[PDB]
């Protein structure tokens, strides 16, 4: 499977870090704090390949974690799910682990495949959880930059 390692960063220059075992948060990092940003293993997978929508699966390197979309109060939410490392990564991954990589401008979105109109989002305020945001045009940051690592 075609998969590369990289770091994500929202439009407002907020990096993504681990906050406990099963949560990401987005805060500004400076100097050696920047070392602590999480490296994603974005696996390119099969799915509905529209104009700008490339389907992908975001994993956390050597932690055996993948970002999954699931319901709680009939409301889709972002959660980091444990995975068998000898099985994954895979071509035909389950729709809860699948995000549409939208290049809407020269910015990257990440829409949920299983839950349309629900995008990987961050808050304005520093050091708040990464979640799934139900709007594109709201009070939340749905647009990200990408920095490739190898």
């Amino acid at each position, epitope marked *: 499977v075609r998969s590369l390692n990289c770091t994500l960063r929202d439009s*407002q220059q907020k990096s993504l870090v681990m906050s406990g075992p099963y949560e990401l948060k987005a*805060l*500004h990092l*400076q100097g050696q704090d920047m070392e602590q940003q999480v490296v994603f293993s974005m696996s390119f997978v099969q799915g509905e390949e529209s104009n700008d929508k490339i389907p992908v699966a975001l994993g956390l390197k050597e932690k055996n974690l993948y970002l999954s979309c699931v319901l709680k109060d009939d409301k889709p939410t972002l959660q980091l799910e444990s995975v068998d490392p000898k099985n994954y990564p895979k071509k035909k991954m389950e729709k809860r682990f699948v995000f549409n990589k939208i290049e809407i401008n020269n910015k990257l979105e990440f829409e949920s495949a299983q839950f349309p109109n629900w995008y990987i989002s961050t808050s304005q*305020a*520093e050091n708040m*959880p990464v979640f799934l945001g139900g709007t594109k045009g709201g*009070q939340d*940051i749905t647009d990200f930059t990408m920095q490739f690592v190898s």
Partner: antibody, heavy 118, light 108 residues
Framework: QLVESGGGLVQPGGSLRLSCAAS????????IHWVRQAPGKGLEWVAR????????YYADSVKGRFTISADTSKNTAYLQMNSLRAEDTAVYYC?????????????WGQGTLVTVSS | DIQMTQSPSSLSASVGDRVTITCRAS??????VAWYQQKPGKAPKLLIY???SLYSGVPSRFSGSGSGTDFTLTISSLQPEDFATYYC?????????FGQGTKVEIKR
């Protein structure tokens, strides 16, 4: 309430440690920001620390020279100031910040006057 | 370092009047704008956070609106205790930056 101490008059090149003691909440759940106001000018953002993570971020005018820290056991935040300049003369405020509960520098200390002069 | 150009420098208006303070950004800060009220020789007080959201305990006569780059603080009816300088802030991008403030002085 956030109560500051440590201010006063100091030689150029000198050192001064400012404290920000918190009452009525634990600083562990917040960031503590430091904001200075030069005599008769506006507000300038100095630095902030998340005590929990130990994450620090400095303005370019104080990076290297100033060190922000926190002792969660003393529910207190610090700004250690070194190589002080006439330019660092200001009232220094500390303020709390938490996004998840809409505490957007909602509490500020009384402020403490730091005069840098020979 | 995102510049927060605040207008005007100072203003005056009579008790009960309607005045709006305007704050413009050097680049897009999204919805990460707050408004602070500082009385002479005292610590700033939070009024508006997240462009439009009013902080608990603030009179409803205080409201704010934004458009990514252009943000307005608006006060419908001036009360007595509003002899204050008003600062805009952006906290979406670090370093955090403030406007130079607007002093509002009650007319007689």
């Amino acid at each position: 309430q956030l109560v500051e101490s440590g201010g006063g008059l100091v030689q150029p090149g000198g050192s001064l440690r400012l404290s920000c003691a918190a009452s009525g909440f634990t600083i562990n759940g917040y960031s503590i920001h430091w904001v200075r106001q030069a005599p008769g000018k506006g507000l300038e953002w100095v630095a902030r620390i998340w005590p929990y993570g130990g994450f620090t971020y400095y303005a370019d005018s104080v990076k290297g020279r100033f060190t922000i820290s926190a002792d969660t056991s003393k529910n207190t935040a610090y700004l250690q100031m070194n190589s002080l300049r006439a330019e660092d003369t200001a009232v220094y405020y500390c303020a709390r910040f938490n996004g998840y509960w809409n505490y957007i520098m909602d509490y500020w200390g009384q402020g403490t006057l730091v005069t840098v002069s020979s | 370092d995102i510049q927060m150009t605040q207008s005007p420098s100072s203003l005056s208006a009579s008790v009960g009047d309607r005045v709006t303070i305007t704050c413009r950004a050097s680049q897009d800060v999204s919805w990460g704008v707050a408004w602070y009220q500082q009385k002479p020789g005292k610590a700033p007080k939070l009024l508006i956070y997240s462009t439009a959201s009013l902080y608990s305990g603030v009179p409803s006569r205080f409201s704010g609106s934004g458009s990514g780059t252009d943000f307005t603080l608006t006060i419908s009816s001036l009360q007595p205790e509003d002899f204050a300088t008003y600062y805009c802030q952006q906290y979406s991008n670090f370093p955090i930056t403030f406007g130079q403030g607007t002093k509002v002085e009650i007319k007689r």
